[PDB]
Amino acid sequence: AFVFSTLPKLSVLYLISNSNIGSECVWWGLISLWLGSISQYQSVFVRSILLYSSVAEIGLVLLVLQEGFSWEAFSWVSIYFLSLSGVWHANSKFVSAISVASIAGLPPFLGFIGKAQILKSLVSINLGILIFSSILAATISFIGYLRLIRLMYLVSPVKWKNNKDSSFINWSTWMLTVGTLPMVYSV
Amino acid sequence: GWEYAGTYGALCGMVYAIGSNVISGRAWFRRPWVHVTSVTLSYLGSKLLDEVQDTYYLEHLKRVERKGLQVTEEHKKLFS
Amino acid sequence: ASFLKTIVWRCGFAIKETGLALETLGCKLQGNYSFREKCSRHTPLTQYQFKAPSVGESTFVAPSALVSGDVIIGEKSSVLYNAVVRGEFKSVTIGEGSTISDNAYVGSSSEFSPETVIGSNVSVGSGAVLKGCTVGNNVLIGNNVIISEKATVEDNTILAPGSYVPEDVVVKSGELWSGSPAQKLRNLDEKELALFNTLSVGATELAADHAVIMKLLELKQKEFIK
Amino acid sequence: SLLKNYPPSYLYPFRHPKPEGVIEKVLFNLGSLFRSAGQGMDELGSLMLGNGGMQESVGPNLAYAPVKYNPAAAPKAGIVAPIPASAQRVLGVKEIVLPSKAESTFIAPNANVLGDVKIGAKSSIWYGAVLRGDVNSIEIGDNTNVQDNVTIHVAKHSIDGKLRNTVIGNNVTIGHCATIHACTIADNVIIGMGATVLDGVKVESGSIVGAGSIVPPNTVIPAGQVWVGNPAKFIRNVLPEENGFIASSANNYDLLGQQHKFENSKVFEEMLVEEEIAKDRELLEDKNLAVHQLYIFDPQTQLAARPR
Amino acid sequence: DEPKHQIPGNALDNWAFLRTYAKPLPDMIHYYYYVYLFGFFFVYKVADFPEYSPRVLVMAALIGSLFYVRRDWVHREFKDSP
Amino acid sequence: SSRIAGDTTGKYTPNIFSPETPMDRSFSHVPKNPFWEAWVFR
Amino acid sequence: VDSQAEWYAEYDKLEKARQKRRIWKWRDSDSRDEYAINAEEPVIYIR
Amino acid sequence: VNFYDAPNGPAVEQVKIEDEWYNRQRTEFNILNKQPSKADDVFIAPNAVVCGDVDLYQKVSIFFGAVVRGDLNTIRIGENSTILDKAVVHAASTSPTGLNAATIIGSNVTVEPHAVLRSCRIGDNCIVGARSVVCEGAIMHPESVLAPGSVLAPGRQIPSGELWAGSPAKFVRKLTYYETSNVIRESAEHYYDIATGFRNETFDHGSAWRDAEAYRQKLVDYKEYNWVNYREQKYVMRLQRDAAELEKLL
Amino acid sequence: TFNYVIPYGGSSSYTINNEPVKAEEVTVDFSKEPSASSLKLADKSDWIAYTFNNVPLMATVGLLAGAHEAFLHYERTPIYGKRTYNIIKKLAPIVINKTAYATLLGAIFCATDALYENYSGKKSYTSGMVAGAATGAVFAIGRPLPQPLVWPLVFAAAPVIADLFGEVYPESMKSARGYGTPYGFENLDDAVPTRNPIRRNPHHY
Amino acid sequence: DHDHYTPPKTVFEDTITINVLDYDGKKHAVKALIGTPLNKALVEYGFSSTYFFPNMGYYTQHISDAHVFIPEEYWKYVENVDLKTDDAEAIKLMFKLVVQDYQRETSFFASYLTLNKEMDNMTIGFGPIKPWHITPKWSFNGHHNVKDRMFDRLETGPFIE
């Protein structure tokens, strides 16, 4: 689920950007942003929260990519990959918390840079409805991510399988923490 | 570009070694070999990243000049 | 200061850890996997950082026994089999002629434990739990006697087997105490008072014989190793 | 097994066979260099670590341990054995008493059985049990389980001639952390966990001593009675069902002893091989692997049994 | 014992109301097929729609949000009757 | 029935097994009221 | 401690960064298909 | 003797205790099909023995001399629970009460030295005193303390917030709010800090193998060492047993 | 200012004006102008015409909602069991009623908006507020107590939100460029572009 | 002041036996303590993992629930739930996804019934459950042929397989 919710996207974004496959309609990204955020808030299962987060974000990213902001989508996909790696390959509560925070967009982590690129692109196009929707939908999504943080450290004792196969997971968590300062030039 | 990339990279390598020890439940000082390797690799990667960023900055300056942006000598100085 | 010693320990430990890791890598390259054998890694006199058990020349410490941390054991004393003497948190002192019997625990590992002091000619019975207490000279402790923290046992006293001494209770000299809440039973007769030295010297003799047999065991192990 | 082409490294994980290839020989020599440099660094670090240097050595086997033979007081329970000539010319002890154990007996490696100890068939001495027969003989009967951290002690008979040997009868259960001094225990008795039996106590057959009970010295516990308390006193008579419980407990601990003996007795090479078997069992749990299509693996040892 | 929130309703009546959600559940593929098909045709048609005022669009979105019925709502109230 | 938990000398130990209740910080807690607690909740 | 020099140096550094940012923000489409906007660029297509 | 249906197979070679020249006791070992489970931060002292189906949760500390035997039934130790010196935790096959016979230990439970727990339920934030026996079927409720030298008879319960003492354990006093909230949890945290300290100075593979290796090398040089394919021998032994059992007429 | 003595910010002279300077030498626009259709639909001159042009949207939304609910009902009904009743007779009211109610509400909103704008004669926020309020009043005709207050507010607010972020926002922030020199500050020495950046071609889908 | 202390009852006194009809139809006597929820009592006895499902609530998935049939006389002891809260959302979700058609008027969840002295010798039965899925690890195919125990599952609840 992790590898096929991130890797395929890069190819589609490259095709759209290079082949001028953009539409004037903003309804589809606006819909994805609102549906995804509301469905993330109303979803009991944690897999659905993570799946709907990608819907919302890729809706916003679609809106940004139609307007020609290729560099920002290619940087976003890489940050999103690194952010999703630790939540999906859950083994440690701390790694998962740092991942959820990066997906949420908290400023100390690399996820903030990725979200910032998209939001910065949005203010350039100067579409008010998109910005308002983005703020409200992001708040709704944040509530779902807070639910995820609550489930791990504030609901009940948590015991997980000792799947000690963190190939790139430690590196990804490090890259999320450390990477914010090097990539600050972009935003 | 950044004049503090080497220092940052060394400190980040330390961040990797300590963080990896802490996540696994070991103390920060454990596995000393990991610390040297992490520090060196992170320092080199940070430096390499800075050259890559500079190279693409200069490529962009070339492109914008070709397009027609009338960049001055001082602007051509901004991009090392 | 303490910080300097901590830094020196951390440096030496890092060097030793790296050395052992390089030895393990050499074994892996050679194809020998003897390093992965899980055998008893118990050490009779374990040291925590720089705190190491001080031991007298005539003392007998059983191989199965664990003397941990800074424990000063006086001459002609014996810590017998499967006895745990823990002095890591706070120091433990054992006087001349004192014997710790089999499966006995003596320690000061509670957070608020006072420093344990054991006097001369004190025999701790098999199974006694001693935690942060002062024992005076010529005291006989019972088999399962529990002595709580801050309790003091005065000289020339016997604690009957199974007695529990609560905290801050002083056991007076020349008396016999018994019961879960220890209370004085009778004054010690002259024969018991004289018996203490004989018991101590007998324990020392037994410890010497055990030491000789232990040396025989070391020679046997040496033959296989070398 | 179906296949005979298994890599030598796979067949002998504990020690690979002598290197034959040029690359393998170079790797061996490099490993020798790494081992020597590592031992050097280890020694340098040990100097900084200070007194003791955190050194570690193999521990002696105290499960079957000798005791100094007394020419005056001949051994009663254990056998007496000579000591290697060299140790004689160094130590000077002519002979040493050694414990006497039957083949079925299980003794834990942790346990310390010393000197004049006779253990019957099917009896089990568990972890941490110290049985010291230095001064007097200890006799343990058949199907008797000495549990964890039990200390059995003896004394000298003395001028009076009061018998200070410990005789434990058949089908007796000594509970965890119990301390037994110079006492006699008859057959089919359960000693509770934590109970201290002092010198001179005779426990008759069919009785149960309660947990954490100190039986006062020179006290005869009559048959079929349960005694509990710091000064052990009679509470009730043993129920008919409880005799069955006693026997069941002894038989169960006999089976437990057999299982523990089996697990502990395996040699290191076998333990490592079994660790690899277990690891490959975990890896092979996934049934969509390509190797599963090729062959069906034996469950106990993950070796190819038949083609699929 | 601690102060607790009062629960409106009787225990058995509330449980009975909750039990009206325990009905044969259709598979979601049937709904998804139709939504995918019509959605594709809708996207193709949307390119040809006239440009509408932002105010009209927002009002249409409001009306659609108000008139949308959650799937659970129909599920609980569905009766196989005339 | 009560004992002084605090020791100025620094040799403070919690006698968790003491029959007598320690005069710890919990000695001075005020007794709550079932009706006041429900008023606070309301 | 020459405060005037430090202030002018800091202001200059910020102004240079702002200028570099604005130059960086001038970005035409990089689409391979979009030959018209990028006519002067030297590209080779292997297709 | 040899268990032929063992999960990992029969034992090709079994060594007698008389022949062992060194101590080979393992701190964690599997008894037949039952495997102990441990978290990464669980400290098991070298002296300690943990066998069978024992599940050790995060921050569990097993100190020197402690035996946690999970042969008859399952033992679960909760988070930040410390088993101190010479303390034996065992499980019975069946309990007299008729409930589950697993020895479940909750979080922040301190088992003081020489205390034996068998087939008992110890609630969270509890302290068992020194030389205290908890018998089969006894349930100790959370925030309760058993004083040193006390016996909980089979099938008995200690209520929450109470200190109990005596050989036939009886109520002494109600624990204060401060004791239950802070002292009990603090004791477990102190023993956790001691175990963490012990864990920091322990090497992954201590230099105790070298002595055994020296003997193995000597044998190899004198050509007495033999290379045994244990997996093949186990397969062959099982085949022979099955043939023999089929042949047997009674 | 970053001081406690003088007021922060600054003052600009009203008398002195700065002559406009073009952002670039040549301006290429990739943004297409509004279509004749957009202007036709936006024309509120004749209320009836305005209403009939803009109702298709409300009708479509009502049809989608009714189709959704009808499908949900249809999916549950069992094919294997024969049903006495006709499914279409049960389902057709759902769709028809939803479409009719949606169209009626959108007609009320469009009519009131056009009528107020004509009577007032000015394009203003109030026209949207009064159209929303009237629609919300019609929505809450028989609803319990809170709803009469809440719906006129939510409905009135919706045209306010549309006006603020659909019309005022873009016109307010038209001048900002992002390339070359800041809009207000052209004296500063920043790289000057010959042509504006063209990030995308005019759309055609 | 200083009223009489009430000594606690022994486990033997406070153990109640409940007859539980399993899916295969066998009747098991499940000894239980007064004051324990039914779900926990059933889990301790040793029923398989297939017989239980996580409570499908936002923050209650750690709890393991079972579909049970309660006799009309013991309906009083079931716990009331507020519809306007999320506990109702939990119950509605478990009915919609697990019970489905196999619902009966006697159908209830074990967590909402607490064992008491008056529930001695009560006969309860496991109600049929439909195949359900949350995560690949936490799911039910529909085959009650595994011989494990729900007790032996250390993992608290679903999250990410």
Ligand SMILES: CCCCCCCCCCCCCCCCCC(=O)OC[C@H](COP(=O)([O-])OCC(O)COP(=O)([O-])OC[C@@H](COC(=O)CCCCCCCCCCCCCCCCC)OC(=O)CCCCCCCCCCCCCCCCC)OC(=O)CCCCCCCCCCCCCCCCC
């Ligand atoms: C050592 C010198 C390196 C310095 C510069 C590098 C360039 C020289 C390449 C030299 C190789 C070093 C690799 C470094 C870069 C990799 C690029 C590259 O290699 O190709 C580029 C180069 C030419 O392309 P170009 O320079 O990009 O310019 C083309 C146009 O300008 C069009 O391309 P464009 O896209 O770059 O256009 C400009 C672009 C502007 O684009 C940029 O500004 C790029 C910014 C740089 C970001 C760097 C991160 C990218 C991640 C990739 C990591 C590198 C992996 C290495 C893979 C190759 C390994 C060799 O403008 C845009 O708007 C487009 C959007 C671009 C994407 C947006 C950037 C965001 C990226 C994601 C960042 C988000 C952060 C995530 C985490 C960050 C945490 C710190 O190609 C080559 O020179 C030949 C390729 C040969 C590679 C392998 C062949 C050798 C071996 C042959 C046989 C192999 C089999 C045997 C194996 C042997 C070993 C066992």
Ligand SMILES: CCCCCCCCCCCCCCCCCC(=O)OC[C@H](COP(=O)([O-])OCC(O)COP(=O)([O-])OC[C@@H](COC(=O)CCCCCCCCCCCCCCCCC)OC(=O)CCCCCCCCCCCCCCCCC)OC(=O)CCCCCCCCCCCCCCCCC
């Ligand atoms: C920042 C802004 C962001 C922007 C960009 C960011 C950049 C992005 C990318 C950046 C990525 C950074 C984060 C990733 C970090 C990479 C992960 C990592 O840290 O390592 C993972 C990995 C994890 O190890 P592990 O956690 O133990 O688990 C592996 C298992 O053991 C599994 O066991 P195994 O079966 O797999 O065993 C294979 C492996 C793993 O095996 C092991 O790791 C076992 C331990 C190896 C032996 C011990 C190392 C010996 C010397 C280390 C020096 C430590 C000094 C501390 C104490 C001082 C002692 C006096 O064996 C190896 O070590 C292969 C390497 C060959 C070297 C072995 C040693 C050769 C002899 C010494 C060479 C020269 C001696 C000079 C001085 C000697 C003493 C100072 O660590 C290593 O594999 C170590 C690699 C090399 C070992 C140290 C060699 C250093 C050379 C000696 C120091 C001289 C100064 C160095 C400069 C000049 C170099 C010659």
Ligand SMILES: CCCCCCCCCCCCCCCCCC(=O)OC[C@H](COP(=O)([O-])OCC(O)COP(=O)([O-])OC[C@@H](COC(=O)CCCCCCCCCCCCCCCCC)OC(=O)CCCCCCCCCCCCCCCCC)OC(=O)CCCCCCCCCCCCCCCCC
């Ligand atoms: C014959 C086949 C049957 C299908 C019929 C047609 C087939 C489709 C053909 C074409 C489909 C493309 C276009 C249809 C709509 C696009 C949605 C879609 O297709 O996703 C797949 C969707 C199923 O996807 P799913 O992922 O499996 O379900 C996720 C849900 O969790 C599902 O779980 P749930 O239903 O149980 O949970 C529902 C949840 C899901 O949440 C949502 O529905 C999120 C949607 C929110 C807005 C969506 C973006 C709006 C932008 C529209 C763009 C155009 C206007 C431009 C400018 C507008 C600026 C906003 O919302 C609710 O809780 C109910 C409330 C409804 C909206 C909540 C917002 C209320 C705000 C009103 C304030 C008034 C309250 C004040 C008083 C309060 C007191 C404190 O299929 C459909 O629902 C299609 C049914 C078509 C009915 C739509 C009704 C009107 C359509 C246009 C109006 C735009 C608003 C959308 C409203 C509801 C849409 C779901």
Ligand SMILES: CCCCCCCCCCCCCCCCCC(=O)O[C@@H](COC(=O)CCCCCCCCCCCCCCC)COP(=O)(O)OCC[N+](C)(C)C
């Ligand atoms: C400027 C850099 C910043 C930009 C970021 C993008 C650029 C990347 C730069 C650095 C990339 C580093 C990637 C880190 C990967 C971490 C290493 C790793 O994953 O090792 C695995 C490798 O696992 C494998 O599967 C090994 C298979 C292949 C091994 C490596 C393949 C090497 C191929 C050659 C690569 C050279 C590149 C070729 C030319 C560029 C081992 O983990 P496990 O053993 O599976 O589990 C770990 C268990 N535990 C940690 C808990 C102890």
Ligand SMILES: CCCCCCCCCCCCCCCCCCCC(=O)O[C@H](COC(=O)CCCCCCCCCCCCCC)COP(=O)(O)OCCN
């Ligand atoms: C997020 C904004 C949403 C508004 C929130 C208000 C509270 C919601 C309650 C619902 C009430 C419906 C919305 C009414 C808000 C408009 C303010 C009324 C003021 C007013 O009537 O003047 C109009 C202009 O104001 C205007 O229409 C423009 C004023 C912009 C609205 C206020 C902006 C900041 C409010 C945010 C506060 C906190 C945010 C949290 C929601 C008329 O103008 P005219 O041109 O027609 O002159 C007349 C010539 N005919």
